[PDB]
């Protein structure tokens, strides 16, 4: 089915994700409701849910949402249309964390305003979100941040420790964004870049334009090898760009791979001009749509007769007791998840092998 | 003298129940007394040998479940069972299905017993419940439905 493509339509309606500037009025929201109806009719909703979660994370972590009330009501609309409760709970937790992060940033700006840090207190924003819902990966990659940001992370860590002692903050450099100022001769144009792109651009800043090799860049940025190449793809193969900021590639080739020992160098007189006419006060966004962050059928047959065995052993049981006995029995086999047990639960009740008690919503009766 | 009665060859009604009155069995089968009232036979008498054979089959099954047949007759209001006969059935301790092996086994064993000199017929079946008391489940209830409604003399 369409799945992800349909999710793209949502990205074109709920917020200005990229080319979604075509917004007319609130009636489009009604059209979104129709899309929700499609989500009811179609199958394979896991991909759609994952795409929607990724789009929401990309929109919220960048503050590019066209509307706020529509985004808040989208959770209720999705819950009404029918979706797993885990996704709804994760969305609610993400929204609550985003709400709390505004107050945290305001408190940080209001309190730390005498140390002067490095940049002005009105130019640094801190957004701390819970890692149990807003993230899934747990891998840390060095970025070798510049000296300007080397005095801001410790201050944020100290403030978080003072206010909410008991939790550890693990900074995620992939989702961070910022604006840098260039001085490429004719026109000084602001550029929006992530942490890795900022490090790559600032590596060739301690000695004018000059020229550096791939090995030197890798040894300076200290990035995770192959991922560094991906960052280069953002600075050498920017789509719909008249002239890239880092207009170099040595032996041509392609930004995908085969970098080898290419000598990339920044173009001092690069023609990075908005509308190709006088880049006096231009601004270029280079982040783009990055948003960086036992076969099943033979295995599902294992647990159903296990549930039926638990039921045939004892007629009366509760939900918690059923879960405890099921996980007690199935330890020798694979470790059960939560989604599989739930799926088996309504597969059993839909086959009317068990009866849901009317007085008690959790009590089950064998047949 | 010390035991008084003793026993050379004499017996009583205790030894009399082990026989096969062909005319009596034929006439009770033809008359069909239990087909007219629901509250028929309430007394079931099973010999020792069948009991120990069932127990050994259940123990040899182990934590799993076993299943077999039984042989006997009916006499008036009472039911008589005096033989146990196991089956080569396999399955999980929560469900057992009689494959073609049991279907080819019961007939073969019945023919072998007839060749031996046995004259009784199938009377019912025994199933072992490993732990969950002694009560018929839904599938057991349906099977007993069909068995007692097609093969009127029966018992589980």
From Swiss-Prot, chain A:
Changing residue 58 to A: Impaired interaction with ARIH2. Changing residue 289 to A: Impaired interaction with ARIH2. Neddylated; which enhances the ubiquitination activity of ECS complexes and prevents binding of the inhibitor CAND1. Deneddylated via its interaction with the COP9 signalosome (CSN). Residues 299-360 form the Cullin neddylation domain. It comes from the Eukaryota. There is a cross-link at residue 312 (Glycyl lysine isopeptide (Lys-Gly) (interchain with G-Cter in NEDD8)). It is found in: Nucleus. Core component of multiple cullin-5-RING E3 ubiquitin-protein ligase complexes (ECS complexes, also named CRL5 complexes), which mediate the ubiquitination and subsequent proteasomal degradation of target proteins. Acts a scaffold protein that contributes to catalysis through positioning of the substrate and the ubiquitin-conjugating enzyme. The functional specificity of the E3 ubiquitin-protein ligase complex depends on the variable SOCS box-containing substrate recognition component. (Microbial infection) Following infection by HIV-1 virus, CUL5 associates with HIV-1 Vif proteins and forms a cullin-5-RING E3 ubiquitin-protein ligase complex (ECS complex) that catalyzes ubiquitination and degradation of APOBEC3F and APOBEC3G. The complex can also ubiquitinate APOBEC3H to some extent. Belongs to the cullin family. Component of multiple cullin-5-RING E3 ubiquitin-protein ligase complexes (ECS complexes, also named CRL5 complexes) formed of CUL5, Elongin BC (ELOB and ELOC), RNF7/RBX2 and a variable SOCS box domain-containing protein as substrate-specific recognition component. CUL5-containing ECS complexes specifically contain RNF7/RBX2, and not RBX1, as catalytic subunit. Component of the ECS(ASB2) complex with the substrate recognition component ASB2. Component of the ECS(ASB6) complex with the substrate recognition component ASB6. This is Cullin-5. It comes from Homo sapiens (Human). The chain holds residues 403 to 779 of 780 of the full protein.
From Swiss-Prot, chain B:
GO terms for molecular function: deNEDDylase activity; enzyme binding; macrophage migration inhibitory factor binding; metal ion binding; metal-dependent deubiquitinase activity; metallopeptidase activity; transcription coactivator activity; translation initiation factor activity. A motif (JAMM motif) lies at residues 127-140. Keywords: Acetylation, Cytoplasm, Cytoplasmic vesicle, Hydrolase, Metal-binding, Metalloprotease, Nucleus, Protease, Signalosome, Synapse, Zinc. Residues 44-156 form the MPN domain. One of its GO terms (biological process) is regulation of protein neddylation. Changing residue 127 to Q: Abolishes ability to deneddylate cullins, without affecting the 'Lys-63'-specific deubiquitination associated with the COP9 signalosome complex. This is COP9 signalosome complex subunit 5. The chain holds residues 12 to 167 of 334 of the full protein. It comes from Homo sapiens (Human). It is found in: Cytoplasm, Cytosol; Nucleus; Cytoplasm, Perinuclear region; Cytoplasmic vesicle, Secretory vesicle, Synaptic vesicle.
